[PDB]
Design an enzyme around this catalytic site. Sequence first.
Site, short mmCIF file in Angstrom:
data_model
loop_
_atom_site.label_atom_id
_atom_site.label_comp_id
_atom_site.label_asym_id
_atom_site.label_seq_id
_atom_site.Cartn_x
_atom_site.Cartn_y
_atom_site.Cartn_z
N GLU A 146 20.84 16.77 35.15
CA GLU A 146 20.99 17.97 35.95
C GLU A 146 21.01 17.59 37.43
O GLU A 146 20.16 16.84 37.88
CB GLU A 146 19.81 18.90 35.66
N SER A 155 14.04 10.83 36.20
CA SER A 155 13.58 12.07 36.81
C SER A 155 12.33 11.76 37.62
O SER A 155 11.48 10.97 37.19
CB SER A 155 13.20 13.10 35.74
N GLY A 192 10.49 16.82 38.64
CA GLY A 192 11.86 16.46 38.92
C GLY A 192 12.91 17.07 38.01
O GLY A 192 12.60 17.74 37.03
N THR A 193 14.17 16.84 38.36
CA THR A 193 15.31 17.33 37.58
C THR A 193 15.22 16.90 36.12
O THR A 193 14.53 15.94 35.77
CB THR A 193 16.61 16.80 38.18
N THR A 194 15.91 17.62 35.25
CA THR A 194 15.86 17.26 33.85
C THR A 194 17.00 16.29 33.53
O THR A 194 18.12 16.41 34.05
CB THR A 194 15.91 18.53 32.97
#
Lengths: 250, 111, 198, 241, 244, 233, 242, 243, 244
Positions: free
Chosen positions: E47, E75, E30-32
């Site tokens: 992010e 995340s 997943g996104t940071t």
Amino acid sequence: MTDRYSFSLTTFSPSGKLGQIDYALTAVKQGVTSLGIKATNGVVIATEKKSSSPLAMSETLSKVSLLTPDIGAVYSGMGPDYRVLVDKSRKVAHTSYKRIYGEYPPTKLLVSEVAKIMQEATQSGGVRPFGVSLLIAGHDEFNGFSLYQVDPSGSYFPWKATAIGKGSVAAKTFLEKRWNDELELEDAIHIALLTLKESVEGEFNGDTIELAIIGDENPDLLGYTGIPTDKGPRFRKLTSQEINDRLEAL
Amino acid sequence: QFNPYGDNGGTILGIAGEDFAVLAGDTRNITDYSINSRYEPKVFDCGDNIVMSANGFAADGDALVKRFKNSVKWYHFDHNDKKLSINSAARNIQHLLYGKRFFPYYVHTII
Amino acid sequence: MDIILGIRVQDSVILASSKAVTRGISVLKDSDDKTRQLSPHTLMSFAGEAGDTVQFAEYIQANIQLYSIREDYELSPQAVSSFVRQELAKSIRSRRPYQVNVLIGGYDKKKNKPELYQIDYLGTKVELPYGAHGYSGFYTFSLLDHHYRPDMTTEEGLDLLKLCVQELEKRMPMDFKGVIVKIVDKDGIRQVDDFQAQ
Amino acid sequence: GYDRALSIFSPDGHIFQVEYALEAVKRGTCAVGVKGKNCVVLGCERRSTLKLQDTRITPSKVSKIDSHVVLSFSGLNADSRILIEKARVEAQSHRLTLEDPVTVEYLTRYVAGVQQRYTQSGGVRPFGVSTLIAGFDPRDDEPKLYQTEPSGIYSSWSAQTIGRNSKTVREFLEKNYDRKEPPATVEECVKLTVRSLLEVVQTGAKNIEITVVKPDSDIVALSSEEINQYVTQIEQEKQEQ
Amino acid sequence: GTGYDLSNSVFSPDGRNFQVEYAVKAVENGTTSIGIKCNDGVVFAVEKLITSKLLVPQKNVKIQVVDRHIGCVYSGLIPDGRHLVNRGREEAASFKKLYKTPIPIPAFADRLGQYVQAHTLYNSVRPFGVSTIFGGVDKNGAHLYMLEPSGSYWGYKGAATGKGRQSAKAELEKLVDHHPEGLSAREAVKQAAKIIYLAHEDNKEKDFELEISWCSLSETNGLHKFVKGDLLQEAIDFAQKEIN
Amino acid sequence: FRNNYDGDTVTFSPTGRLFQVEYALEAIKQGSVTVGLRSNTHAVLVALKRNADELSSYQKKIIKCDEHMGLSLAGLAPDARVLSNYLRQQCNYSSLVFNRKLAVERAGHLLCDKAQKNTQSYGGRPYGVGLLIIGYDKSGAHLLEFQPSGNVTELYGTAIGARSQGAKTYLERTLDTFIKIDGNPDELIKAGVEAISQSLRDESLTVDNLSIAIVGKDTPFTIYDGEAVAKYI
Amino acid sequence: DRGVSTFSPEGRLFQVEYSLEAIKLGSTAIGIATKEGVVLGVEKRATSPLLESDSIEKIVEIDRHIGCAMSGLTADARSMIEHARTAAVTHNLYYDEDINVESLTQSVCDLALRFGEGASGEERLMSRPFGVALLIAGHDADDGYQLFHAEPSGTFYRYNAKAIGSGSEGAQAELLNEWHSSLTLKEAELLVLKILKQVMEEKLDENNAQLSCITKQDGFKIYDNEKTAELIKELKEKEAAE
Amino acid sequence: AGYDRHITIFSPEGRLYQVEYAFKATNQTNINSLAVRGKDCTVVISQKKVPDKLLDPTTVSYIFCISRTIGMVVNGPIPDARNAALRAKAEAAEFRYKYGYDMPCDVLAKRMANLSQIYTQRAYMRPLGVILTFVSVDEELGPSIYKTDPAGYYVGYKATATGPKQQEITTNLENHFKKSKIDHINEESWEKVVEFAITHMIDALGTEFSKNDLEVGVATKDKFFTLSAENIEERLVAIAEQD
Amino acid sequence: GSRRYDSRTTIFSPEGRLYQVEYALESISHAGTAIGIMASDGIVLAAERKVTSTLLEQDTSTEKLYKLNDKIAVAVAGLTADAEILINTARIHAQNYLKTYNEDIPVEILVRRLSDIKQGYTQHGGLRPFGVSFIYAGYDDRYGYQLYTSNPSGNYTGWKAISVGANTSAAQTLLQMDYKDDMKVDDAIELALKTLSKTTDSSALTYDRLEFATIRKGANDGEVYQKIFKPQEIKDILVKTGIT
């Protein structure tokens, strides 16, 4: 969440065997030896205290439990399973008997209740059988002294003397040779200690041996005086000292 | 003890013409001998050319009208915005009311 | 309350039940049969609360008929009466108790003897030579206590009964519009359609 | 608690548990029923895997649901009891609420309903039973004969059979029963029944039981002899040729 | 044997729970997102991958508030995250209802911990597919926490999870060393905007959108709030500058 | 591999995926194309209705959830009914209890959370339908995209279903233009129709095959079908 | 094993798909709509000559203006019909009016996906989907004569003509051509009788086939054998006519 | 058939693999701990390893205060440790409320042991991968150590050790007692018992410790508490001035 | 989920058989033999104690013959523990009937219920069946002395003579060879001991391996009487019938 194991975990195999009960019995065989001998004026149950560490305190863990003031129990197999069975047994002796008739249940009946609890763990949904066999020794006014064995399947049978666990085969044979229908309690305790000696590897003393009896009433253990009809418990666990004093005349 | 009911007064009137109908009501809301409001609408347009008024105990009257209007809303959803005929509304209201047969909406309703 | 009389003679049980059905100010019917047949040789009469009365009787009937089919057998009168007592005893501690009093008249085809059972709404059961519910006993018992005999014939019974109904018509304040009489014996249940002048 | 879907669809659109339920029926003792012009007869065969029974007390195959309707079956016996109990209870309930005994078709539709329900309900297996329900509707003289199966499907038959070798005895019936002229007599109807059973019972006077149903709750089960007689008169028909 | 990884509460022969481990995989993918504990509060940043010009800017907000003083960011599987926050909101509500005092961050942490750990006890449930960074200010200052799908969590000075979690941890560790006396709220915001920009390299393919929130005793009065307008653009610059 | 991990939603694959959910998503791709786009004054839904025979009817793709909200579907029609019906209740609840029109963003959250419940508990199954939600609330026009996984996103425009990629590109291309079609609903609709036609292939959009919906400033959510959409073909 | 409500890698529900297979094996059922009414015909298909063919009920009345024909595991349709009849009756009790044909259909389809072993969404108790499809035909003041096809999938379609069951695919192609918006009820009757005849293994007579219709004036009616026999005859004559 | 290794049912040898593997997980943390009994106190030592620099060292612990008098140290993953801690705390509060007196250490141990025994018999509950060491100064039994495991087993000890190198620590302690001939550390102050503990932990593991390498808990009459890094440093400095 | 470990104890084999019932029977076939012989003036129940020892207390032992009512007793073949569960619900059923009607429960009625209970574990609940087969010996004023039998399937039947458990094939042959309708109780008693004596797997047939019961109508009374022979009583009868 919510237990979704509403089906039996113990079922019949094509050969008619109930796997889990068999395996449970296997677990019992691996267990430490424990025995019971019925005399004319008492019964005795004993086992070895296989201290799982020299830093442990064998006294804090008793394998011989009082169920009612005239009934004791001992086992072979899974200690934790036995512990909860002991609590259930003590409770059932009250809820299903003492709270109704105002008296403790007779040995056979309590034994029967216990066996039922085990039977259910053989058929109820989502559980496994208990991995222990018990030896219950007690005494009731109308049936005198008795000794019973209860198995993982929920079966039970009366014995004059018997053993379960590791060296049950050998011990049972030694008992068949020394038992007779004229034994006094002291004689049974003696034979008990002898039988247990063969099954024990290392130290054999009052601190490595656990032994209790069902004999006369112990008024001195009642806790109060003033009621003639009340005379005390028949169950009494021997002290380390008492065991050693006897080991000398072994 | 606790009395779940009250009386807010009010008076309503409904007259049916040959090709029209009217439903009127005073706009006074009361409690005992006091006036709560000199203008508190009591007659409502519930859509599909249906006017309704549940007079008596205002709390209940509002509950009812609100519940009926909602029934009209779903009637449109469920039956493709089909218009609810006056007769159908009457029957529906009978059920709304009788559904509380043992703890009634203390109101005399007219549509 | 209505009239519910029962008398057990030598070889049968006789049940007499008032025919009037009064509702407040008006007598709605005068030909009401206050009885249900539980089985070929068992009859039950009843009186009490408006709805409860028949609801209870039919409920009992349905159950005895079910037992009969399942077992292809007719429960003894005693057994039927015990079942009925148990049911009324439950009712008494329920949310809304059946206010029904009943008389059970049956012929035990095994013992070859007629039997009369009296049970009130509390589940109070007693076996008797003759009995009644309500006030009926108050005017009739003195007559029965006097003339009743265990070896009486069905005809003598019907006569002693006619005697009772007359006393009820003389001293009781209400017009119960007569009674319907029924007999239970070894051959079953039958109605004495001619008691309006027997 | 337990609600595992035991009856489900397989790729080809089958419900094996129901299909396997029929297998249990195929293995059951044969049952047959033929309707006459003013009666219906039900015949069932008796196994012999073991013989030293007490016929007095051993539960029979034909059961009464009400004084005017009966039910026989092929398949698991333990299962049949549950269906029979339910039917008997429904019968009393119908009398109690509608004040009129059940029509044979209704009592049938009910039983078929129970069976169907046990094919799409969680935690239960279908009944390993097929039934024959017969009798006369209240105040009617036209004989009724219906059949139900594990799937829950049912229908009426002039004559039908279920159980082992039911294929055989059915063939017999197909070329031995004329709808144009149904067994106009209780005797000639009970005969055709025994004839069909003999095609498979293989000489079994004590292996064959019959029950006759006539209008207005007239139900009776014949005794060995009465039946043994039919067997006799039939074996001559053959030899006399 | 094998198959110790097909059922959720099963211990493998080495004592692991593969299903939880597989859950972690969804997280790592997943996104940071990160969290920085400053001298009187905490800062959250994340992010937001611009999958396409079609996504309305500034709209699909990721960071969530719990009560009025707690911030949460995660995340992995977003719906799983919301689910956990919903639980947290109930958890905090009941706590305040009986104790009056808004839930202490450490206490809130264990509530989420016990809940998430509970989803690794039965095979009838699936573990949470998210790592959550959350915290806020309470009676005893600021607290920053990170909760793993296994239910494990600890207090952090700085925390990161997601695709670029490594860059972030490297950067966060630098801050820790170059600020033994503590970072300020204003500063943590900028430093957060930077670390996210740096971490965006392990995903430099799609363009992204930055989101920041903070809970500071002196800057927000202890209540959780989103960094917007000027202070936001400002941190965006401080980052865009140091990325070159 | 996958075979051992796609038997339910309570199981993660070794790479952290949820196959049952992914399979659900496939149902959408296999569905008929539908487009959604909005300006600052309106939100539009255009959908391609599909039929079985030429003796059958065309399945409806647009459902109204309230006077200011509605959606178009791609995937399991039944599920769309379950979800849109749940959305109607939420709109209804907000009105009765708070005398407040439910915000599109809020509705989106509710949908997300509901869908999520059927992806973490044994027994349930993910929803097999995609939804495009348009509505006009206190903050203007809105377009949301709902996915069975639970992911709900706010966009200027988008499209789901088979060949959806076509329109999605056209929209991503026309963005700067349609996002400004304020106060001219017919233009916005034409833009939507042009977008959806970028995903055609089999046939061309006819009168009993095209379905359009609109909502905005002073426009209660309304659906157009048949002759009603004629002036756009 | 595998849950009863699992998805295939192609996005379909296994149990529902298999359900559809069982229906392909069912007896043929055909429905034709015309501005003069709707005809519903089915293939009895007795499994033996001893089976009284009229005890085969595959066409039932839901309400006076709604009837339906079934195909597939027909025992499964009992509860479906019960629900349907109760819905029509209940709607009348609550609204003092007839239920719209489409609504009735939607109501029935709503039971369809109510299966599982513990599906999170309510309390869907029914271990498997239904293994039978239905052709619901009726009339209402809103959209007049209508014909619906409701499947175990929970979905339903409106048709001008539709055939389900073992002979369906061929029969549908037929209908595709034969049907036109100006058919008369009588023409529809013959057309159904004709297509049934073509797809049936058995020689269509008034015992292994059954007709029925729904018209505004007389409502739903099931043609008795005599009435159908004549239509069969009338058909043989017109066919041999060229 | 091979599923007798995924749920708590018997294997043909009469074993419960899932319980065995749960034991396996107790070492996941790679931390050792030991508890000893003083003349009138009880002490528990546990290694502390906080490698990540981003972690707040102060929020990393495996020692819990179950009640004013009972302390519990856990050898195993932290989420199961916290689950067990929360439960024990609940059990202790409830016991006081119902029976009117503080729940004894041995009783709390038994109760938790019984809870574990259940996960051993019921199929849907998985065992917890932890070993719990309960300590206190019981008002009846004096200094106490009771430890329970994933098998539902439990017992009291003179002293005990748990972890990857449990054996080394144990034999070290065994030796010390064979020598002293008594079942406890003949020391009046707990500070000295803590020093004894740390010293033997060092001898047994052949490792020196700093103030952040340890975690210490102490139970005295009517109070269990844990030492701070500084309280420990002082303890460490003390042992230094003897070697 | 749990589906993975569900054995499905209640389904049909492709042949239309019930696995568990089949296997349960297979289990019962290894249980000590139990025999029931019904004469004209009484019934006899005889069972062979499977597995015994010198120490086994026999005076206090009862593993195969249980008194259900004053006029009904059963002989058990299979899992004793399972039997007791059933036996007890039976004793209760008898009393409920008595309480409801004031008439002792007809023998078949009690048998049909107990059998129905067994049948249940066969059709729903996902539990294993009871591994038990019963031989009921009872008496009532409607059918007089009766002999019934039930097994795991839940089916029951009536017999003049029958055996269950081990070596039934052999025992059944022997009984069908010497049984005669005109038998008198004592004749039946002797037939029973002989049959067992010939089907045993043991060396000799001693009393310490037997359980015995008779339901006769003690002529000097007019009522029926159950009698579960005591060890010495079995020892005596054993000598007399010439088996010493």
